[PDB]
Amino acid sequence: AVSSDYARDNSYTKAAEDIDAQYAYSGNDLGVTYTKDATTFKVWSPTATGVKLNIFTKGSDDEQGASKVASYTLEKMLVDGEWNGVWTITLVGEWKDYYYTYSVTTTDTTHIGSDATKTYETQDVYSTATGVNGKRSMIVDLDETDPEGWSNDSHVLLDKSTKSSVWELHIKDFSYDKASGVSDANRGKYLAFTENGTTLNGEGKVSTCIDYLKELGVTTVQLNPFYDFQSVNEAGDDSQFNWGYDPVNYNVPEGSYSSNPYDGKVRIKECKEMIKALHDAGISVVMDVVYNHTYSTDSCFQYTVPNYYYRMKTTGAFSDGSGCGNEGATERAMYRQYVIDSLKYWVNEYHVDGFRFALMGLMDVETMNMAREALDQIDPRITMWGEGWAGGDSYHPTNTCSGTKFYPATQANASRLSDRIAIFNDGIRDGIKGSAMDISDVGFIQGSKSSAKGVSYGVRANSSGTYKWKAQAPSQCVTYDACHDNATLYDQIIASTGLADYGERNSEAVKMNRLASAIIYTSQGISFTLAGEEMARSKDGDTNSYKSAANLNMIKWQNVVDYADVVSYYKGMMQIKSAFSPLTAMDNSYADKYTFTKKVSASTNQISFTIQNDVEGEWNKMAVIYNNATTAADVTLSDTSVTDWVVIANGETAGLDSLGEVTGSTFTVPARSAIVAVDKAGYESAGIHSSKGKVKVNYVYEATGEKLEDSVILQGSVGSGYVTVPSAVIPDTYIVSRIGGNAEGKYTSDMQEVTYYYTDYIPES
Ligand SMILES: OC[C@H]1O[C@H](OC[C@H]2O[C@H](O[C@H]3[C@H](O)[C@@H](O)[C@@H](O[C@H]4[C@H](O)[C@@H](O)[C@H](O)O[C@@H]4CO)O[C@@H]3CO)[C@H](O)[C@@H](O)[C@@H]2O)[C@H](O)[C@@H](O)[C@@H]1O
Ligand SMILES: [Ca+2]
Ligand code: NA
Numbered sequence: 082a083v084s085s086d087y088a089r090d091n092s093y094t095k096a097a098e099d100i101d102a103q104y105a106y107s108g109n110d111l112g113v114t115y116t117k118d119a120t121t122f123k124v125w126s127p128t129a130t131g132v133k134l135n136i137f138t139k140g141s142d143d144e145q146g147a148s149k150v151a152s153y154t155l156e157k158m159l160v161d162g163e164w165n166g167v168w169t170i171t172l173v174g175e176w177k178d179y180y181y182t183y184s185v186t187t188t189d190t191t192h193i194g195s196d197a198t199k200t201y202e203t204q205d206v207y208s209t210a211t212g213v214n215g216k217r218s219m220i221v222d223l224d225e226t227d228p229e230g231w232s233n234d235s236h237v238l239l240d241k242s243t244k245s246s247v248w249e250l251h252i253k254d255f256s257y258d259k260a261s262g263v264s265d266a267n268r269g270k271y272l273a274f275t276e277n278g279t280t281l282n283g284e285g286k287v288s289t290c291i292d293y294l295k296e297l298g299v300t301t302v303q304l305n306p307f308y309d310f311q312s313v314n315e316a317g318d319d320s321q322f323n324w325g326y327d328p329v330n331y332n333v334p335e336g337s338y339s340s341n342p343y344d345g346k347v348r349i350k351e352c353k354e355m356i357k358a359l360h361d362a363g364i365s366v367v368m369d370v371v372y373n374h375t376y377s378t379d380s381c382f383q384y385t386v387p388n389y390y391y392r393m394k395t396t397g398a399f400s401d402g403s404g405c406g407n408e409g410a411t412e413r414a415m416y417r418q419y420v421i422d423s424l425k426y427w428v429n430e431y432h433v434d435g436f437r438f439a440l441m442g443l444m445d446v447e448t449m450n451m452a453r454e455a456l457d458q459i460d461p462r463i464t465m466w467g468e469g470w471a472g473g474d475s476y477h478p479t480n481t482c483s484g485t486k487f488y489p490a491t492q493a494n495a496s497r498l499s500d501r502i503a504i505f506n507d508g509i510r511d512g513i514k515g516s517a518m519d520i521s522d523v524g525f526i527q528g529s530k531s532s533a534k535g536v537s538y539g540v541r542a543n544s545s546g547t548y549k550w551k552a553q554a555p556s557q558c559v560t561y562d563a564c565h566d567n568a569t570l571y572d573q574i575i576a577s578t579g580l581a582d583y584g585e586r587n588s589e590a591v592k593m594n595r596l597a598s599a600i601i602y603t604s605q606g607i608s609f610t611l612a613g614e615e616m617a618r619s620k621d622g623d624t625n626s627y628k629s630a631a632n633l634n635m636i637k638w639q640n641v642v643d644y645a646d647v648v649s650y651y652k653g654m655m656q657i658k659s660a661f662s663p664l665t666a667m668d669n670s671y672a673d674k675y676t677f678t679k680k681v682s683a684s685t686n687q688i689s690f691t692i693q694n695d696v697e698g699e700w701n702k703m704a705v706i707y708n709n710a711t712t713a714a715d716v717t718l719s720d721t722s723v724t725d726w727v728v729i730a731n732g733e734t735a736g737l738d739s740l741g742e743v744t745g746s747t748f749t750v751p752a753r754s755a756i757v758a759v760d761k762a763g764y765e766s767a768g769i770h771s772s773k774g775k776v777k778v779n780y781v782y783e784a785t786g787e788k789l790e791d792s793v794i795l796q797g798s799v800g801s802g803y804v805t806v807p808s809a810v811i812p813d814t815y816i817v818s819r820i821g822g823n824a825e826g827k828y829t830s831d832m833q834e835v836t837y838y839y840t841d842y843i844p845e846s
Contacts, residue, residue: 084402086475086489093393094478096190100127100389101414101482104166109422111167112207113220120176120220124155124183124206125415126385127166128193131155133184134170135202140180140212140219143316144343150179177225180217180345181205189387201384206419208330208381209430210345213316215309215329215336219345223430226349234357236434237365238462239300242503242607243555244665245464246655247367248294249564250612251305252338252355253322255290257635262289269319269631271307271338271351274358281638286802286825287645289638295362296798297615297648298655301464302359303367303437305565307352309333311376312628315342322631324565326405326439327376331423356432367435367464368427372411372420373443374403382409382416390416394476402443402475411448414482420448421455428459438490441467441504446488446497447481453499466503466559466607469495469550492550500553500667503607506560508549509539513562513597520568520576520624525600526593526753527577528709530684536707537681537688542606545672546681556667558606562597563614568624570597571617584619586643586809588791591617592732592753595650596707599730599755602654603705605664605671615651616640642804646778646793653735653773653796657757660737660769661703662696676720686710687750691720694763701763708750716756717747727764730757734794737771739764774799774828776835780808783818783838797828805835816842 104127114121124132132155139147155168186200204211210219239245256263256273262283267273279290288296310325315336325335334352336342356366375382378399382390392400392408402408410416427433438444444467456463469492477487488494492504510517512535515524525532538548542558552558563570572583574590581587594617601608611618613636620626626634641648658664663671674693679685689706702723708714726743729736732754743758750756776795781788790808797803804825807817818840822833 084471084473086477088479088487089395089476090478091395092191093388097389097413100190105414106165106167107418112205115177115220115222117175119171119173121169121171122155124168124385125166126168126185126187128190128386129168129185129187130198131186132168135182135184137180137217140217140343140345176220177222179220180212181220182217185385187387190389203381203384204330206381206385208333210349211309211330211333212345213336213342215333221346226346226353228350228354228357231353231357234360234432236432236460237360237363238434238460239365241665241667242464242501243667245301245607246299247301247303247607247609248299248612249303249609251324252307253631254635257631258638260638266340270340271355274355281642287641287804288801289641291358291362293641294364296801297652299364301365301367303369305369306371307335307338309335313337320631322628322634324627326371328371329376332426353431360432365434367437368433369437369439371439372409373440374405374407374409378407389413392475392477400476402471402473403440404472408443408475411444412477412481412487417448417482421452424452425455428456428463435464438467440472442469442471442489442491443475444490445481446490446494447483447485449490449502450499453502465501469504495550495552495557500557503557503559504552506539506543506558506606508535508543509560509604510562512536512539513600514570514573515577517567520573520622523577525709526596530686533685533688534682536600537677540604540690541672541675544669554668555605559609560601560604560606561609562601563611565611569611569618569620570594570614572619572622576622583622588810589753591647594647596753596755598651598654600707602658603664603757605666608658612636613640615648617644617647642806645795645803649794649796650735654730656737657730657735661694662699663692663694678719687714687716689716689718691718698767700759700767702760704758706748706750706756708754711752713752714750715747716750721746723760725761726758727761728756728758730755734796736773736796737769773797774830775832776803776805777832778805779834779836780811781836781838783840789815789839799828799830801828803828807837811839813844814842815839
């Protein structure tokens, strides 16, 4: 089922609305305002009877030189005897690098003015720095946290969101593997991203980490939570892992990814160095944000203004729409403001280029649209997308703090949402590889004919017609087959077919992987992959790896060799989408330029369509065919307008070079493979060609000269290193007797061939 939302007004919502009408504050100076001469503290809490500032030398009581300094009484901000809801004090002198908490004595929202008070110690709601484990805030000069050349670091923004290629990455996963070639100190840390010239096992043969990303050519890296989360003990062991969907401090970097979580400035500088390194690599940084819930209701929000910041049921229970125990009340004036101010902070202070909203379905449409407008004032190329669903039933008031009707930012309400707030298309996801809820379930690539309609509607970003949900335009659609949640693409292929064990190479499974690649990059919308999808990433069948072993979760960098051909295929498919404007369109101007051979809703083993282009200097027409049959199929296009074709992607390779020609309207499409072709006239005139070198790898029985296994194609930049390997799937009764050509070397302009010659063998042991 899809979870429900309910409009219910009660004592709590009416109390919160009254608080907004009187005390809503837009002053822009809540938290700490540092200067060398003085530091000013501001806390918003209309429910409070008193607020006390506590100063410490260190962020925890374990550290050397840790001591309580003193405590101070904050005073109400009055004008002509009228309180604006804000507490303030100004400390004269130099207070930088001191740590602090607030002691808030307060009622709840439904008992303001009463003697029913409780006192809570808490970090600042508007913390820009904390000590270890985010318990104590830190007074910092943010200038001191700027790395070398930070002033010259610019945003990396896509001209159009639909021109993106997103690599969804977890910071520990990136470099926790020793084979990553990243230094001992920086493995699984922010600073891993700053290490150039890293290679597999540091042997200097093939690129890893940042150099690998430059070669792959992804436009965008989306980072899993690097705001401060609860679920990793920052004073604990290095082997701890969590995705970090457990927020504690929204505007403070995560401590565990830094080299030193005790000094609050170090993580800020190192977090900025990561973002700079990615910007220097020409890559856009998208931040996974989780305003929909906090780890617990024992939070800075609840301790400051009890029952204001969370959606309250009539029974006094916290609404659990997140499935994590609570949901943030985005409809409230001061959380709306907090969220928007937070987004602007990460953009301006950390140079973040966009956001992925966790459970965007829990966040109200008005708030989301206002956030889009705010970020537009900085730059409208700043990207926004999110999950158009919740994680449970959500109880909200009828209206927002503005007096407009509450609407959740779900798939169902895509029409009410800005067309530049994109939504994850679970339609094409389930269409391609099968239900995400069931690892054993088949989609189109595994041979489901019923799944074809999922793919076919996905091809135009679910923006043409209606199947499941409808995007306003391709700009409002994220096109993907897998993410960090549920099974990896290759794990679902393995589980659903039983072709092999998890993480084991299988020729037919890899064919299916290549086909998924073809679909993603011949589909409209914002193309998105899990980091390592291109190298057949496995989690050993883990369908919820959020707190699983770090070595299970980590990117196995050996896969860039083991699946170098698959990486090469993705690398080439990315080039195709980038070269052909209809695929990267933001609007619906190309919707009526598609000619599907069969009905879009057809149950078929072969999907085919043509796309008419209108951009001068590009290809005039593209033909796309997906064949999920176990045999080769002759597919005849219904569109006969073009009868001279150049093939640019097949079962073997993909890219901008001609792989052969086709006369007429009929194409022979190999089993479990795609064909991408373009009009010959256009291919000649456009002058679009590859600058990448090729290596063909053959596997031959020496005695007969016959192939034991299909040849594969590696592709990469001329001068970049490659490593070929003997085929993993060849029976154990054959052994490599001899190698022809350069098994290892650098790509050249001319294609090189490597042949692994095999002889008769009996394992024995
Ligand atoms: O008080 C209740 C409860 O609170 C704490 O546990 C919270 C929560 O922890 C687990 O949920 C996990 C999921 O299993 C993960 O898949 C992940 O979900 C996120 C997903 O990956 C994102 O894509 C999406 O945007 O956001 C979701 C989360 O909203 O992360 C969550 C949170 O870590 C567990 O499965 C839940 O049952 C549980 O409620 C606390 O640790 C518990 O002791 C406590 O009982
Ligand atoms: Ca933390
Ligand atoms: Na283009």
